[PDB]
Design a protein around this ligand. Sequence first.
Ligand SMILES: C[S@@+](CC[C@H](N)C(=O)[O-])C[C@H]1O[C@@H](n2cnc3c(N)ncnc32)[C@H](O)[C@@H]1O
Ligand SMILES: O=C1Cc2cc(C(=O)NC3CCNCC3)ccc2N1
Ligand SMILES: O=C1Cc2cc(C(=O)NC3CCNCC3)ccc2N1
Ligand SMILES: [Zn+2]
Ligand SMILES: [Zn+2]
Ligand SMILES: [Zn+2]
Length: 425
Amino acid sequence: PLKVEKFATANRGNGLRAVTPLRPGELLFRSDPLAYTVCKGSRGVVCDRCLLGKEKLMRCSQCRVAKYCSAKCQKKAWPDHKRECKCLKSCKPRYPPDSVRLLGRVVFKLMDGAPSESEKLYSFYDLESNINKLTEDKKEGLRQLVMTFQHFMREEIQDASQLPPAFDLFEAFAKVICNSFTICNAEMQEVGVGLYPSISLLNHSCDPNCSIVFNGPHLLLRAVRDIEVGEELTICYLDMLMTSEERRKQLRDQYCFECDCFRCQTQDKDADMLTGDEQVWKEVQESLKKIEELKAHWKWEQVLAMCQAIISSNSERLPDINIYQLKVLDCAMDACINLGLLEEALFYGTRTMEPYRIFFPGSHPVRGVQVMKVGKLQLHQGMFPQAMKNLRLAFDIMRVTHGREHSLIEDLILLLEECDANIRA
Ligand SMILES: C[S@@+](CC[C@H](N)C(=O)[O-])C[C@H]1O[C@@H](n2cnc3c(N)ncnc32)[C@H](O)[C@@H]1O
Ligand SMILES: O=C1Cc2cc(C(=O)NC3CCNCC3)ccc2N1
Ligand SMILES: O=C1Cc2cc(C(=O)NC3CCNCC3)ccc2N1
Ligand SMILES: [Zn+2]
Ligand SMILES: [Zn+2]
Ligand SMILES: [Zn+2]
């Protein structure tokens, strides 16, 4: 017997609930993806299988688009790449939308693949599509995806025979919109997209009681506070650095619902998020469109230059609690880490600590990882009392959000032991 179950909610479809009390940090479920792919910005920078960045990737010789860190990865990937390769070679110097490559892999994984453990609680067939809530604009976008898919797969899929029993491509793309997980690497960089149908049972809250974390493509679902018997299990679908208006847009546009959580009812934190001079934060918000695109493509030198122009502007500056300023600091910190500018990374990272304490309350994996980054930076600069405080705090968080089953916890424990050797009596 599991400690959770599927149930029919009153007004939000199916959900997952606790069938026994759960404690912070408890592992509730784990899953490989039904299907996944590298995301657009990371294609060619990270390995298509393990989603790690390496100096050197080796191209699939047959398509020259899918890239691997190693023979191990090419071989472990081949069953699930074998049918899409031809399709990728034809389209370049051009490339299908991530959703299309993802659905291609679902369609092959269904037909060709043994049944998937990712579907133990809920299957692809069961996923919500929200078809009766889609607007005309969204339906038009789905129709285009269907046409794109039919072109991409004409190579490997011409008729009903190669698509699953009673398969409707329009409905399948509708499912992909509201059930696609962004896969993040250990450093919380977005690197892939996948389907995890059992995890798609979880409804959303802006103040959730569970969290997911990724270790490569593998997903761990954990409780992040005490949960009572019968309580519905929730995760936050969204970035924490968002006002309630911003959250409302994304939840409507992507998920077709109106959030009734208490944070949305109270507009919790909205005004604190937008402190400082409007002329400046409006312009920073605009600049972040470019900065975030550059970051998604791992263009660190360009990210850093744009961020430095803001952080160290000759013109007016923002408080670090302003969410747009905060996002700029965090992009700059990650750019510096990746460029080996570790002193500079620490200045920006340390500035994010208190805002992150405020905006990622309780135990949130993104805060755990940020605090760990800052402690690591301090450790390697010989700032041992500071590092030890931060590494301990990171562990406080990550023992709950990541747990022993996540490899990053082993890395963190090594840092703690290293630092302790310098501060111990
Ligand atoms: C990933 S699925 C979650 C499981 C879903 N309820 C089902 O029956 O398959 C996402 C969809 O669940 C619904 N949903 C999730 N969180 C919600 C919430 N807090 N309030 C209302 N509907 C919600 C929406 O239909 C949304 O598009
Ligand atoms: O069924 C689904 C699909 C889905 C996707 C996400 C999701 O990918 N959220 C992202 C993660 C990276 N930062 C921005 C927000 C979170 C929860 C969820 N449940
Ligand atoms: O095996 C099982 C299945 C199961 C279901 C539930 C259950 O449905 N609990 C309710 C939900 C609403 N509030 C009060 C509690 C509670 C306990 C339990 N043990
Ligand atoms: Zn690899
Ligand atoms: Zn190939
Ligand atoms: Zn909400």
